[PDB]
Amino acid sequence: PYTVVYFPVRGRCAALRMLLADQGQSWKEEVVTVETWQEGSLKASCLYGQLPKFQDGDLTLYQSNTILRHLGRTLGLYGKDQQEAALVDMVNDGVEDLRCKYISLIYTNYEAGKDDYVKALPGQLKPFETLLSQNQGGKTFIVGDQISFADYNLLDLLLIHEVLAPGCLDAFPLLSAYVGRLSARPKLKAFLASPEYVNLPINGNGKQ
Amino acid sequence: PYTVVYFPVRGRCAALRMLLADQGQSWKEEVVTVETWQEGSLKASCLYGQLPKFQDGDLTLYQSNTILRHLGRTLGLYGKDQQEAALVDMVNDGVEDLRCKYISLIYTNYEAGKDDYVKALPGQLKPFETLLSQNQGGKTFIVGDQISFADYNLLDLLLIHEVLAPGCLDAFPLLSAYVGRLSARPKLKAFLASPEYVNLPINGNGKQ
Numbered sequence A, B: 001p002y003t004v005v006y007f008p009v010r011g012r013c014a015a016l017r018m019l020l021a022d023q024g025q026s027w028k029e030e031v032v033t034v035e036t037w038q039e040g041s042l043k044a045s046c047l048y049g050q051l052p053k054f055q056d057g058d059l060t061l062y063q064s065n066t067i068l069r070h071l072g073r074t075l076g077l078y079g080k081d082q083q084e085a086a087l088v089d090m091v092n093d094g095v096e097d098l099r100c101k102y103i104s105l106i107y108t109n110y111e112a113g114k115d116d117y118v119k120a121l122p123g124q125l126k127p128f129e130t131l132l133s134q135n136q137g138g139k140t141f142i143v144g145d146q147i148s149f150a151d152y153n154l155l156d157l158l159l160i161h162e163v164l165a166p167g168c169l170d171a172f173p174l175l176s177a178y179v180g181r182l183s184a185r186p187k188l189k190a191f192l193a194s195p196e197y198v199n200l201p202i203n204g205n206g207k208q
Ligand SMILES: N[C@@H](CCC(=O)N[C@@H](CSC1C([N+](=O)[O-])=CC([N+](=O)[O-])C=C1[N+](=O)[O-])C(=O)NCC(=O)O)C(=O)O
Pocket: A007, A009, A010, A011, A012, A049, A050, A051, A052, A062, A063, A064, A065, A103, A107, A202, A203, A204, A205, B093, B097
């Protein structure tokens, strides 16, 4: 019953598509061209002048996380209790803080400090490796014994980092095995090798 | 009760202190200082190298939005349903992107951005005024007919721009009657005039 609006990019939507495609779900897509947003026909119709946009039938939503937390809750991808759902919310704000830092490296400074960003990236990644070493051994998901929407938000932030700085996971043993076992999950490994996701750019400016 | 470990400023905890003061809660502050945080060991033990940290007993926490959704779903401020609970995450994530850009100029360019961040404001609060006129007539809370942590964070976001650009709400009626109707709330009008709030810096660098 879903629909997703966005530009023909991977951007802030590549993570909510991985959970829908791996959850055994299905959805329709809608798209905005590079010029339909250069018109006003859609930037004023949005609650913040931006996309992704979502539909759940009679509902609509904005913000990449309101949709990621909305499908975790309506699909049981939010933890098992009030506290796992707090440690599943703690990984996501950190995961949304380092991507908010990656969005500025790919759109406002990739040529004047794109190497000062890979220089401090290990420490930006130690935190999540520190939580897996503190999990069931790192042999599970990022929280509890079940997967959550935080796993698809970190698995993409970890997937798009292996592309701007190859070998950024060689110091993090557990993130290297957790990022290899989730892309191997049957329905998501089928979505990563598809043209639907293999043919769009990670970003809108074309850099990576 | 709970505990808050943060710098002697209002910064990121100012909304949960209004949530814990307006919700009949009690708590302790573990004030921290630039002489204590520069000592190192307190920041090297944080999960991301930052504050505030917070607790509910054995459960520790970091990330200010995680503490607002965790006190939100534990205090009964997270919606009456799943779709109102996502319509609350939509107002909190937007109040966080405005608060995410109000925090970068205050600490990274207050002398070259305070003349452009203020003419770009009108357009940043319209959404929030549109959501009130789009619910209960705007005579209630930002979402549903009940209060939420999204409401304790959008009010703090409106009390601070009222300090960087006083008179920024003069064209946003429902937003001007809502920042006074929430400050009139009994236990919130009593804590907001209290010493631990008024003698605290909104920010931690001098500007505002
Ligand atoms: N916090 C919100 C932020 C949403 C957001 O930033 N949306 C951007 C797309 S992201 C990114 C991007 N960008 O950050 O500026 C621009 C882009 N593009 O094609 O022009 C594509 C992007 N992408 O990630 O694919 C947008 O609507 N941009 C239109 C505008 O600003 O007028 C969320 O998580 O949903």
